[PDB]
Design a protein around this ligand. Structure first.
Ligand code: SF4
Lengths: 51, 49, 303
């Protein structure tokens, strides 16, 4: 579908989609939110996949 | 008054604010004591029902 | 040794502050396979000493800004973890409360950091002209945006009504004089209308010659003033086709302004007090507010 979106025009101009430096603040996470992330399914699945 | 209140306090024993970490208020033990009256100026006195 | 590869890439990033491509690393260190270079880059990103740029030439790796330091008291990590979104906001600035929410830190934490950063000339705090609430913070080198602060009209967070009034008066007088001269010329209606027309660049040059105020007025500033005069119903603008000339502002188009008379005199409705009465809704035949005892007609007939 992304390819189809890009295929609207037969020739696509070289996009000036330079990835602006969106280096995000490593926000100090509230301990409640850190516990929520630890208990999140994605975190457990990533930990399983680490092995 | 002999068991449940201690369980409730243990559930909420530590309270702290997000602002200024390393500051906390920790409950250790809770007592209800004997019935008393606050009529006496900053002094308690045993009172019958 | 991957540690040696990481150190060499760090040295290369030091040599090129603008960032290095994979080609530069490969040319500098040719005996190392591409997989080892990719692993080293990934580790360097994992510990956060590098940032990735996507340019039209490909991927660039740049060292994270740590040498540029304004708040070294405490930790360099939080110093850069404030300067980072300070730079991200950039020319538009950022309010202190917004900074606190973006850095997820208490007010005192960011307070000390902001004072220290301003001490080492890393961030400049300017007063928000658009909504005078809090002081926005920008990079010291970055030029402040004319929208978020400053502007030829705003002087110390104050709109200049006198300045815009004088600008309107002078521009309208110039346009009216030009139209009067064009009418008196009576050489030919086409030439009369064309000479009555005044270019935005021409009136801007005339205003600069007048030099009423010290602040430099750009061409689009006078264009906005003339647009306000248009909205006042006193001047008329037409966009004509001119490929290039002394103006050269809009591609193939130039805006010509001429003072124009109003369509009609004031209507008959406003010549009666009831047409201008503010309590017209409450006016009634028999009541407190009645035309028989109306004060407005009393003053109007007495006058
Ligand atoms: S009669 Fe007097 S109050 Fe009523 S609309 Fe006319 S001016 Fe206004």
């Amino acid at each position: 579908e992304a390819a189809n979106e890009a295929g609207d025009s037969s020739q696509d101009e070289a996009e000036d989609d330079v990835k602006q430096i969106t280096v995000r603040f490593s926000r100090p996470e509230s301990e409640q939110a850190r516990q929520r992330r630890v208990q999140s399914y994605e975190f457990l699945q990533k930990k399983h996949a680490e092995e | 008054i002999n068991v449940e209140i201690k369980k409730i306090m243990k559930a909420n024993e530590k309270v702290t604010s997000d602002a200024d970490p390393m500051w906390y208020l920790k409950y250790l033990n809770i007592y209800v004591g004997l019935p008393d009256v606050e009529e006496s100026f900053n002094v308690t006195r045993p009172v019958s029902p | 040794d991957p540690v040696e590869i990481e150190n060499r890439i760090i040295e290369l990033c030091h040599q090129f502050p603008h960032g290095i491509t994979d080609q530069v690393i490969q040319n500098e260190m040719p005996h190392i396979e591409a997989q080892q270079r990719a692993v080293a880059i990934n580790r360097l990103l994992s510990m956060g000493q590098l940032d990735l740029l996507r340019s039209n030439t490909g991927l660039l790796y740049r060292i994270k800004d740590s040498q540029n330091a304004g708040k070294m008291k405490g930790s360099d990590n939080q110093e850069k973890l404030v300067y980072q979104i300070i730079e991200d906001a950039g020319n538009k600035g950022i309010w202190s409360r917004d900074i606190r929410y973006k850095s997820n830190l208490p007010l005192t934490e960011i307070n000390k950091i902001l004072k220290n950063l301003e001490s080492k000339k890393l961030i400049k705090a300017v007063k928000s002209v658009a909504a005078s609430k809090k002081k926005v913070y920008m990079l010291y080198n970055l030029q402040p945006d004319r929208s978020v602060t400053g502007g030829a009209w705003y002087s110390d967070q104050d709109f200049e009504s006198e300045f815009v009034e004088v600008l309107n008066q002078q521009c309208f007088k110039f346009l009216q004089s030009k139209a009067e001269t064009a009418r008196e010329s009576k050489q030919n209606p086409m030439i009369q209308r064309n000479s009555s027309f005044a270019s935005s660049h021409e009136v801007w040059k005339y205003i600069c010659e007048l030099g009423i105020s010290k602040v430099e007025l750009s061409m689009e500033d006078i264009e906005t003033i003339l647009n306000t005069l248009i909205y006042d119903g006193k001047v008329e603008m037409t966009i004509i086709a001119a490929k290039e000339g002394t103006v050269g502002s809009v591609d193939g188009h130039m805006k010509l302004y001429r003072a124009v008379n109003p369509i009609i005199p004031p209507t008959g409705l406003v010549r009666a007090p009831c047409g201008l009465c503010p309590v017209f809704d409450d006016c009634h035949e028999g009541g407190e507010i009645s035309p028989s005892n109306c004060i407005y007609m009393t003053e109007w007939l007495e006058f």
